[PDB]
Symmetry: C3
Amino acid sequence: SCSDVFQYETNKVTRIQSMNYGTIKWFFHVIIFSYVCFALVSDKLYQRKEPVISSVHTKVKGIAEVKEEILVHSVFDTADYTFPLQGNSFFVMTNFLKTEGQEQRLCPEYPTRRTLCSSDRGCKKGWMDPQSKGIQTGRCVVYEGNQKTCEVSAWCPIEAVEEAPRPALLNSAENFTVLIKNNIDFPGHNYTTRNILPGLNITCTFHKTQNPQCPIFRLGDIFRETGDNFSDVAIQGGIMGIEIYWDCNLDRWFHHCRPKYSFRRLDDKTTNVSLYPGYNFRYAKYYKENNVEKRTLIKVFGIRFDILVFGTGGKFDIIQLVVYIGSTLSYFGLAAVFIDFLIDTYSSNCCRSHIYPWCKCCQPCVVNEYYYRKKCESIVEPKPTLKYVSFVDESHIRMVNQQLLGRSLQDVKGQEVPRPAMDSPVWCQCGSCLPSQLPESHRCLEELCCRKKPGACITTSELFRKLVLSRHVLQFLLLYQEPLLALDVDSTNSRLRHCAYRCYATWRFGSQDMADFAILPSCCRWRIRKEFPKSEGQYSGFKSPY
Amino acid sequence: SCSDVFQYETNKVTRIQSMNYGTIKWFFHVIIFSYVCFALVSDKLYQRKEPVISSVHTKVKGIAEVKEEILVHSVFDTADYTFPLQGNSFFVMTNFLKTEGQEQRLCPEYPTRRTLCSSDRGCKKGWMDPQSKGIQTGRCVVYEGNQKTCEVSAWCPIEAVEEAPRPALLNSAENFTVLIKNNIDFPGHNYTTRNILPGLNITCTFHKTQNPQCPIFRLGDIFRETGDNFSDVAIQGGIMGIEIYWDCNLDRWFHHCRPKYSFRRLDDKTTNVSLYPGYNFRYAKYYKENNVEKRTLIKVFGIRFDILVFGTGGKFDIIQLVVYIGSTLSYFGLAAVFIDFLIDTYSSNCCRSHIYPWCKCCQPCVVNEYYYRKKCESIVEPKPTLKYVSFVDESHIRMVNQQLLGRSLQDVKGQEVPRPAMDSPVWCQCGSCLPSQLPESHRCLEELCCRKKPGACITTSELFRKLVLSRHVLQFLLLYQEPLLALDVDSTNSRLRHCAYRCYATWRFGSQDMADFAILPSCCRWRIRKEFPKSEGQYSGFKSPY
Amino acid sequence: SCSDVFQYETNKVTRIQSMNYGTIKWFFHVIIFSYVCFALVSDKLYQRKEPVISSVHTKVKGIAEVKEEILVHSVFDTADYTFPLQGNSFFVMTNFLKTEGQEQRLCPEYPTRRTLCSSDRGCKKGWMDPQSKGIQTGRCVVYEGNQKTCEVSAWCPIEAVEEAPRPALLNSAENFTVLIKNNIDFPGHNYTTRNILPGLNITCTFHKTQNPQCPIFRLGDIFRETGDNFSDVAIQGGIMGIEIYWDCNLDRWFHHCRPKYSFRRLDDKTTNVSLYPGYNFRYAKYYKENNVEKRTLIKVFGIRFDILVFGTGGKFDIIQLVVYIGSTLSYFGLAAVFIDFLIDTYSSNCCRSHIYPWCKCCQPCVVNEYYYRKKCESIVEPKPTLKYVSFVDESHIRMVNQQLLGRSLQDVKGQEVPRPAMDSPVWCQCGSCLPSQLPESHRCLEELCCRKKPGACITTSELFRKLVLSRHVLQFLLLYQEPLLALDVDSTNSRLRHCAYRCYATWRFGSQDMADFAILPSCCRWRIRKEFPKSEGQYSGFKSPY
Ligand SMILES: CC(C)CCC[C@@H](C)[C@H]1CC[C@H]2[C@@H]3CC=C4C[C@@H](OC(=O)CCC(=O)O)CC[C@]4(C)[C@H]3CC[C@]12C
Ligand SMILES: CC(C)CCC[C@@H](C)[C@H]1CC[C@H]2[C@@H]3CC=C4C[C@@H](OC(=O)CCC(=O)O)CC[C@]4(C)[C@H]3CC[C@]12C
Ligand SMILES: CC(C)CCC[C@@H](C)[C@H]1CC[C@H]2[C@@H]3CC=C4C[C@@H](OC(=O)CCC(=O)O)CC[C@]4(C)[C@H]3CC[C@]12C
Ligand SMILES: *[C@@H]1O[C@H](CO)[C@@H](O[C@@H]2O[C@H](CO)[C@@H](O)[C@H](O)[C@H]2NC(C)=O)[C@H](O)[C@H]1NC(C)=O
Ligand SMILES: *[C@@H]1O[C@H](CO)[C@@H](O[C@@H]2O[C@H](CO)[C@@H](O)[C@H](O)[C@H]2NC(C)=O)[C@H](O)[C@H]1NC(C)=O
Ligand SMILES: *[C@@H]1O[C@H](CO)[C@@H](O[C@@H]2O[C@H](CO)[C@@H](O)[C@H](O)[C@H]2NC(C)=O)[C@H](O)[C@H]1NC(C)=O
Ligand SMILES: *[C@@H]1O[C@H](CO)[C@@H](O[C@@H]2O[C@H](CO)[C@@H](O)[C@H](O)[C@H]2NC(C)=O)[C@H](O)[C@H]1NC(C)=O
Ligand SMILES: Nc1nc2c(ncn2[C@@H]2O[C@H](COP(=O)(O)OP(=O)(O)O)[C@@H](O)[C@H]2O)c(=O)[nH]1
Ligand SMILES: Nc1nc2c(ncn2[C@@H]2O[C@H](COP(=O)(O)OP(=O)(O)O)[C@@H](O)[C@H]2O)c(=O)[nH]1
Ligand SMILES: Nc1nc2c(ncn2[C@@H]2O[C@H](COP(=O)(O)OP(=O)(O)O)[C@@H](O)[C@H]2O)c(=O)[nH]1
Ligand SMILES: *C(=O)CCCCCCCCCCCCCCC
Ligand SMILES: *C(=O)CCCCCCCCCCCCCCC
Ligand SMILES: *C(=O)CCCCCCCCCCCCCCC
Ligand SMILES: *C(=O)CCCCCCCCCCCCCCC
Ligand SMILES: *C(=O)CCCCCCCCCCCCCCC
Ligand SMILES: *C(=O)CCCCCCCCCCCCCCC
Ligand code: NA
Ligand SMILES: [Zn+2]
Ligand SMILES: [Zn+2]
Ligand SMILES: [Zn+2]
Ligand SMILES: [Zn+2]
Ligand SMILES: [Zn+2]
Ligand SMILES: [Zn+2]
């Protein structure tokens, strides 16, 4: 109903005045809160992070004097050593080999072990070797004098097999400068900045400590940073990485979006010719001379500079913070988990029978028995088979959640439970019990005696006659609930019989949890039925409430 | 104060010995833990993942014999069929159309339906058609014999409208090989590796099962993988993707960082000429012949290979694991939520009056009544309007949280509550009540009788005279709290009057929660006031504690 | 054991029938659930998001009539104004400066302030100025007539220092069109789509409202969108961004994967010549004329269009949803936290002694005293030093968890605690106490009197003689636990002495929590020992249970 909707259940708690557990709780809480705040700040988990969208524009500056045997000196400019390719990459030629006046004809292949032939049997027509730039014609030919090489259809004259020039022809390229303009955007955050800000000094060169924001880089300085030697790499070439990292906080109070520049060689420093070490490409200049298409083939060596731009932009997001806080909230209940585990363990008797005698430092932790007693109440499943049995000659109570397979309940011994400390037949050991008058199937239930060993019956006790058999007590108990009650003698006697069973069960078992499922001894049962007999019929006996 | 800071509140709990609920709890816990661990391992939620920073370097190898009508055979090398463009992409020419000796002049446009004119009226001076590479001059001209085309300023001779050659001139390009060198970095994790490791066989070609780590790829094999036909795509061209995936675990014990190679065609397999199918571009060779700038225009068809490199690098992060664990901790309380929901539902009487008679399989779930009784205590808001009423002729108690609008409290019937089973006037049905002597506004409160229907007054009960009106009982109760108390007769009588109200309320209502807000019947009230009258003045009556 | 494994502990709770707290709980729950669902939907936190892998293919269409003084008109096509560079970028030449017939020789440098020399002293041999494309030879030379410039080895004739042409020679480039084909993939989700779908109109041009899905873009329209003027940027050049955003939901029921096109200028709108404003590059055409390698140097101005493709693809992931729900579950316990905080504060007496008299609106919140009483039970650490003391002349009880440094326990006054309202020597103020017969070290414990101020001893009370000293009461209490008990007179007397201590402690302190650690007054102690003396020996006294 409506009145049941507007309810609030609060947990019943026990507040413990303990230095140890209070200190533990607050230590746990402070550590957890400090780590939670530290993780939040360090990893900026309150921030939504957006990857950087980058655009790079490079401007390489520098001229080189190049000396080639012919000896002639020439000046190379950007139009000569730079091949406009990309923005996130630029290439600087550092060396070259020139093959001039090539033509599509038949020519003697350059002398090599795979090529040098003695007769036409050492060459197959149409053979396309992976190591040739030509297709075999089948016949050997004189490359020069004694040398006999396999003729091949290709661009001719064939390239000479020669290593790259040493020293590199554009070794002066380490003195070249590149200006890098990097525009970045965070479209989700709608933020864009660039690496060159107004007022930045433009006549500087980058230095990681002196000028770490000058976007002008000397290539030799890049190689020094990486520990690589420009002169060596210039010969055969390579690939260098210019990393631009953007750790950008777009919170206006803590705003910072500047690049960090780092350098990384990207080509393997290998000498395995099978792997094509360095960085080179064959680039052909075409020109029409003598009404024929010609080719100046240049094997271009150089260094490709890859501009690697990466990073994130963070701005405060409520949802991210909420998610993080919710992911951290359950950690504050671990103090309770730990302390409750301590209360549950140290309440165990084992911790005192064996441990404390050995480790006498832990004895003061016996207070957890009191804490557990005040904290936890143990209850059993109220099953129809549940029965509780008390013997006056025993200090404990037996729980029998076990079917009686025709066995006397006196002989069925179940697990012991402690009594709440509020403060003729063969199975009879008191000589005051009578056989059960129930159906034989259910007769074993009442085959129980007040005592496990021979002795005096509990019926002979004073308190049995004052508590259980006193008409005044039972009448008072009945009137307390029904003050004006008036019943026939038989109905009243039945009520007093029930109240007497109740009184015995409460007296010997205590809690109604046990007294509800208690079983009266035959002696007490039949004494009560003698004090309050029914006019007619037979007694139903124990009927479990569930 | 300080002593209040060092406190620990533990929750009071009820431990249930139940097979069903213990099994349910442990089943829930095991399932939740297993799923939590499985999710953690599978998605590596203990790891901080960094996107890969990639650098690609390609080396295409292969020569092609090209036959063009003129019939002449020529050998194409990389310098011829490759246009150095990028690292994450390479292009292989597969076909071409050559237009030689172009000049900037006035020329007859190539015959087309849009172009063919009969007179100068079919061409507008300065017209720039989207389908022309020229600007109209206004006059028709003879392309050849009868053909009359619109003269146009453009590069001349104009290109012939011809499809790409079939078969492709560089069909042998499927036999070409590309070596891909991929360098990757995880700057946050400070890890870099490359796809070619020392010892990798260099004379292999990639195969997805035999050699899935050879970075040398035959282009035809790529197309076979994709199910595309190289011969067909070579004619008009296309775009192929070489995907390099890096699933890299940088935990040293479980370290693995190798690439997975896959292939994906990236151009639409369309035949819509409006959409410019394939991949072609017009590239012009410039040469000075006859002291004039000329142009050999080549329509270059071929396949662009895009190298797509993606992936993540994971290394264990404490913060990520902490966040995940905290996000999973609350799921362990769902067993408690579920079982408490079961206890709350199955405690409902509805589950037994109607359900169990129908579904007799659920009857053993009646134990939840006991569990709920041992688990939950219901309390009401102690409002000034709160009043509890008990009639001896009823087995229940009425709660009246409702203002008395001049109505007798006997006539005001509130909702019924069950009594805690601890074990002359017109509105009078017992003939022992007197009218209220309070102000008329507050007189209706005491207009209550001990019984709802005619009968004997509860004052005639024995227990009323023994519990409520016995001087010994009240004196004992007062001395129990104040052993040495001694008061004037009037003060003592007032104390006994209060204690008698208390005794009636406790006897008929039980818990002080109800007895505090109980209302004594007029009969009992005035009998008590007769047994313990005050010397002078009038009786204040009921004063709610709140 | 096994029976202890199959247990379920449920929390004991108090259900409060309160409009205020029920409404607060449900308001909290509804707000939290609504925000949780809103965050989930808005941020799609049930989805695993994959970054887009993009491939771009551009096709620029348009021809321009170019007029250069010589005055001659020429038609430029793609082969002329487009430099095949990349897919994610395309370049359109908009202006150029041509330097024809350059040769590698010695030439007079172009007149500038840094260059103009009067004699050979104004030029250093081999000097490589950053602003020169040549290397100084050391001698001045006549550029023209009076002008004297420093001779320099370079490509000659040296380029004239001239601004870019105004108006731009390819100003008609704003009428050019580019078709952008964008293929995207989500490899984890195994989804690929493209921006051109079947049925898309191909004769349109993009408009942000009319045709926001036409992938054909007029460049001038892009600049209008950005608010930039194409004519101005065409002169010196620039960089424009075409952003393609993919917000793609790959859930089939809510599936949508289409691009959003936006435009952003990427070059800084700077006029600082040091920063190389615009976008230009020097591109050289090489031709062999007169058996010499020549160079037509073109300074190419134009606009680079960067195609920026970004976005995510989301598909439902169970793990992500589970993580989010778990991160949100603990927020539902904040209603309980808040209401329990309210119960804990408003139970404070301070809220009534001072606050309510001032703020009389809060008085009805005094019910939290009742709620806290029904919710929280406070217990103390049962330390060996813990002792409770009650004086009959005081209404409260004193807790002494403090060692007695030879001080009489009567003089040691500890903190006050309220009694559970169940309902000759110098330190003696009643004249019935005797000195302690314990060892002097432990004698101060029993140096306690029944009353703090002079008066009658509690032993003179009737209830002391009826409850504590009545043999019947104690015998009944002993038989209630041991009905058939029979002991020697000395053992029985010891049992009655213990039970009398128990009865006094229970009567004056109540709960066994206090009565366990209570200290009997010397008067009561010795009266009890007189009523039940031991045959021989001395009395041990108080022994703390812990
Ligand atoms: C870790 C747990 C235990 C405690 C939770 C701490 C939070 C209260 C902190 C974490 C991140 C903090 C935020 C970090 C960044 C910002 C941005 C800041 O705004 C700006 O800096 C920009 C101002 C502008 O928008 O113009 C305002 C404070 C705020 C929201 C902070 C408010 C306090 C927050 C939410
Ligand atoms: C899912 C819930 C219920 C249980 C939590 C399980 C954790 C205890 C697991 C999850 C991930 C595990 C980690 C996975 C990876 C590593 C890296 C491993 O280190 C290495 O492999 C590299 C060693 C090196 O650093 O040189 C050390 C163990 C550790 C921290 C593991 C420790 C155990 C962890 C934290
Ligand atoms: C926010 C808290 C308090 C409540 C949790 C809500 C969930 C039950 C919602 C959140 C996201 C929802 C999902 C969003 C998307 C989908 C995909 C949908 O499948 C499709 O659309 C594609 C069908 C196909 O696979 O072919 C099926 C429903 C499902 C799983 C939804 C089921 C209901 C979900 C898990
Ligand atoms: C950097 O590289 C250059 C070129 O490889 C090294 O100089 C060469 O060193 C070898 C061995 O001594 C000589 O035979 C060559 O004649 C040198 N060439 C030049 C250009 O002088 C140079 O030594 C390397 N750097 C360092 C520091 O060792
Ligand atoms: C790719 O290379 C293979 C191997 O050279 C070619 O197949 C050969 O083709 C010739 C001419 O038809 C035959 O004489 C050979 O017997 C073939 N060899 C094998 C092993 O089959 C193939 O034609 C080439 N493909 C293209 C498109 O050029
Ligand atoms: C792969 O593509 C080639 C070229 O389109 C196909 O070969 C052509 O097929 C048509 C139809 O039979 C013939 O008219 C042409 O003469 C063929 N050209 C060549 C080069 O032979 C080839 O059939 C396609 N692959 C497959 C398996 O069908
Ligand atoms: C867009 O740019 C063009 C070129 O800069 C501007 O046209 C020039 O404007 C100046 C100043 O009035 C004149 O001296 C030039 O002769 C103009 N050039 C041309 C090509 O006409 C134009 O004004 C700019 N757009 C707007 C709207 O101001
Ligand atoms: N706990 C308990 N209850 C009993 C016992 N014997 C009888 N009762 C209760 O007494 C009632 C039956 O009374 P009884 O004299 O046995 O049968 P009756 O004469 O037919 O009413 C039922 O409510 C039983 O639960 C017993 O040994 N233990
Ligand atoms: N629960 C309850 N308390 C009552 C009732 N009548 C009086 N009291 C209490 O008795 C005290 C007043 O005593 P009373 O004889 O009514 O008035 P007095 O003579 O002025 O003291 C107050 O503490 C009341 O709360 C009643 O019907 N029910
Ligand atoms: N709470 C409490 N227990 C007491 C006090 N005096 C004695 N006892 C208990 O009584 C028992 C000792 O009885 P006592 O006559 O003092 O000594 P005994 O004659 O050697 O047995 C122990 O269990 C004590 O805890 C007292 O003042 N307070
Ligand atoms: C007598 O019964 C003493 C036995 C104590 C058993 C508890 C042992 C404590 C060690 C931890 C056991 C639980 C695992 C917790 C892992 C963090
Ligand atoms: C007896 O009850 C002693 C129990 C004490 C439990 C503490 C066990 C060590 C764990 C300490 C962890 C927190 C650091 C110390 C807090 C002061
Ligand atoms: C008599 O009162 C029996 C009525 C039982 C009502 C409970 C019905 C159980 C079905 C679930 C209802 C709550 C929704 C839970 C969704 C997971
Ligand atoms: C009466 O109290 C029976 C209640 C039993 C509750 C179980 C209802 C079915 C839900 C089971 C979910 C867990 C799987 C089975 C555990 C053994
Ligand atoms: C008398 O004792 C009244 C004092 C009340 C103290 C409580 C003050 C309430 C304000 C909040 C204090 C706790 C911080 C909560 C932050 C959200
Ligand atoms: C006395 O016990 C009054 C306590 C009332 C607590 C409410 C204090 C204000 C916080 C309200 C937050 C939720 C919105 C209002 C719910 C109806
Ligand atoms: Na949580
Ligand atoms: Zn017997
Ligand atoms: Zn017996
Ligand atoms: Zn009446
Ligand atoms: Zn009456
Ligand atoms: Zn004294
Ligand atoms: Zn005294």
